[PDB]
Amino acid sequence: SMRHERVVIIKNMFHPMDFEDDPLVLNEIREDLRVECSKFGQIRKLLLFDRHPDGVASVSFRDPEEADYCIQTLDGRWFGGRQITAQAWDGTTDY
Amino acid sequence: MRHERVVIIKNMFHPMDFEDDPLVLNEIREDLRVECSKFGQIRKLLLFDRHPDGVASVSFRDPEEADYCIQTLDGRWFGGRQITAQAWDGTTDY
Amino acid sequence: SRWD
Numbered sequence: 001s002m003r004h005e006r007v008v009i010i011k012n013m014f015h016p017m018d019f020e021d022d023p024l025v026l027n028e029i030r031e032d033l034r035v036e037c038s039k040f041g042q043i044r045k046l047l048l049f050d051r052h053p054d055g056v057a058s059v060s061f062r063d064p065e066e067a068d069y070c071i072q073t074l075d076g077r078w079f080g081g082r083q084i085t086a087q088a089w090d091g092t093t094d095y
Numbered sequence: 096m097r098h099e100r101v102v103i104i105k106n107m108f109h110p111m112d113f114e115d116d117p118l119v120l121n122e123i124r125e126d127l128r129v130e131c132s133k134f135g136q137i138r139k140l141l142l143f144d145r146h147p148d149g150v151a152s153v154s155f156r157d158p159e160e161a162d163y164c165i166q167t168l169d170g171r172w173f174g175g176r177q178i179t180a181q182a183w184d185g186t187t188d189y
Numbered sequence: 190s191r192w193d
Contacts, residue, residue, distance in 0.1 A: 123191065126190055126191060126192065129190075130192055171192075171193060172192075172193050173191050173192060173193075174191035175191075
């Protein structure tokens, strides 16, 4: 929503039950995401909201073009049954 | 001498895919009909929506169409899942 | 469509 927003919100990337019966899956998913997103730009912060029912992650980049690139590439990508969405953070919603 | 016409596809879905949205099962069934119709005439199409392995069966009019469907679909990607496709054993009920 |  901000003119030069650097924070990307990714949704539908997991369900919290994915982590119930194997505690290694969370770290695998987190680094899978870090590996993919570091092709797009310098990551300043990466967060998985591992109990959010909507499967939310946020990736903060150094430059707005990096967030724009990430969004373009990831949004609508299929992943374990769901289309993930990727959008600029509105600058207010918590997860 | 069995000329098997039935293809068994696995890992095409998970039953939890359907629990939130009651339209997804028919959506993916029809998506499978469209793709499989590229290989030949379909006689019968079944999705076993409670099976944890994500199993569907596709029965073709001719064994050559089943063979071609198996060659093309095994290892392909459907909704972000890699599927397997193989000849039915003729005895297992999913 | 979810294909490929």
